[PDB]
Design a protein around this ligand. Structure first.
Ligand SMILES: [Mg+2]
Length: 397
């Protein structure tokens, strides 16, 4: 089970013990919405409770909702059914979900039903990257956006961007503000994944769930667990953080019916990848895309670090040719970065003709391959022909 349960409850009382089918303690509430913790994560009576449920329907698509599933902008969706927002055979993913982004599609392609994170240093345009992915996929697949405890700036960027894009026409957005309740933030991914499960596994669709910012989410857990002194901590957060995150990320995958592709996006607190949030997320997920502070400084958008990014399922969906291009790109980019480091000490003149070719390759890759216009969609073939071109200009083969 999830250690943290979204329960529905009239007049919830802090620390009351509710009977579900196990038992659990109420640790937070907002109106009739409550969060109950299992005892296996408690160091310390009755009443009965229901799991929190929402209407599910395809009418959610095109709408905008808060973290509770309540509409903000748009009508109440026609309830076609009710689903427990806590959730409940799987196949191994083998088809690439193309993003139309070269830095992703070639070396680290994403597969339908994969869970893979994005890690961003503080200040980098992770949110725009989210939007760009959403636009490029919404043309083909249904997007569910789970925006967790986002600030007013961002908040307005999401609303305005999606609406005006007409990406909204094949998207649903579940969004909580930064000044909203911790419980609404914690509810947000759950409500989002609940609709996703419904659209994927009951309506036979391929959906893509973008979820950010996981660090805000963890911080919401830390906020409620703060004044409750019988909830133990590990690494500055509640000890149930690992199992809670796994219970969220594992609500994704591939079946004979549909697929949920999940991309949890997070800020690494001090640009520190060993922080507990990135550390656990990357432990659970099938790789992650890492954003480069260095590329950002060079005014490169999408600032995707080619060598630190990793898609563990990528090879299972790549053709012979695709693996070839992926291999050369990474190997040579890495080689060029070496050459670059040598050059910072002895100059480009002191480089072998080999190292000069790699240095040239890496420079071109940064400028013509990774660097991509927000509104540009690159087919995989296009992306290949960029590499073909760059290979030619560098004089390798
Ligand atoms: Mg940031």
């Amino acid at each position: 089970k999830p250690p943290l349960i979204a329960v529905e409850l009239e007049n919830p009382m802090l620390g009351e013990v509710i009977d579900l089918e196990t038992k659990a303690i109420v640790i937070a509430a907002y109106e009739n919405k409550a969060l109950a913790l299992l005892f296996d994560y408690y160091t310390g009576i009755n009443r009965q409770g229901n799991t929190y449920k929402i209407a599910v329907s395809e009418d959610y698509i095109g709408g905008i909702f808060n973290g509770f599933g309540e509409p903000i902008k748009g009508p109440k969706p026609y309830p076609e059914d009710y689903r427990d927002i806590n959730g409940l055979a799987r196949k191994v993913p083998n088809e690439i979900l193309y993003t139309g982004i070269s830095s992703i599609d070639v070396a680290h392609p994403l597969l339908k039903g994969q869970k893979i994170a994005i890690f961003s240093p503080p200040g980098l345009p992770m949110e725009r990257l989210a939007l760009q992915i959403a636009r490029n996929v919404a043309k083909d697949k249904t997007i569910i956006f789970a925006a967790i405890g986002v600030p007013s700036d961002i908040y307005k960027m999401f609303i305005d961007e999606f609406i005006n894009t007409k990406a909204i026409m094949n998207s649903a957005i579940f969004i909580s503000k930064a000044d909203s309740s911790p419980i609404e933030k914690i509810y947000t991914p759950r409500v989002a994944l609940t609709l996703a499960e419904y659209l994927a596994f009951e309506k036979n669709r391929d959906v893509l769930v973008l979820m950010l910012d996981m660090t805000n989410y963890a911080d919401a857990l830390r906020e409620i667990s703060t004044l409750r002194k019988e909830i133990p901590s590990r690494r500055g957060y509640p000890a149930y953080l690992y199992t809670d995150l796994a219970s969220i990320y594992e609500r994704s995958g591939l079946t004979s019916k549909g697929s949920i592709t999940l991309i949890p996006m997070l800020t690494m607190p001090g640009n520190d990848i060993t922080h507990v949030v990135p550390d656990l997320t990357g432990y659970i997920t099938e790789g992650q895309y890492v954003l480069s502070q260095d590329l950002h400084s060079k005014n490169i958008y999408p600032p995707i670090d080619l060598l630190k990014s990793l898609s563990r399922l990528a090879k299972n969906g790549m053709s012979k040719k695709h693996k070839k291009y992926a291999d050369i790109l990474i190997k040579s980019y890495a080689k060029g970065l070496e050459a670059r480091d040598i050059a910072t000490i002895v100059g480009e003149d002191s480089l072998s003709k080999e190292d000069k070719a790699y240095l040239k390759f890496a420079e071109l890759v940064e400028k013509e391959f990774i660097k991509q216009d927000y509104y540009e969609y690159r087919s995989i073939e296009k992306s290949f022909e960029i590499i073909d071109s760059i290979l030619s200009q560098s004089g390798l083969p």
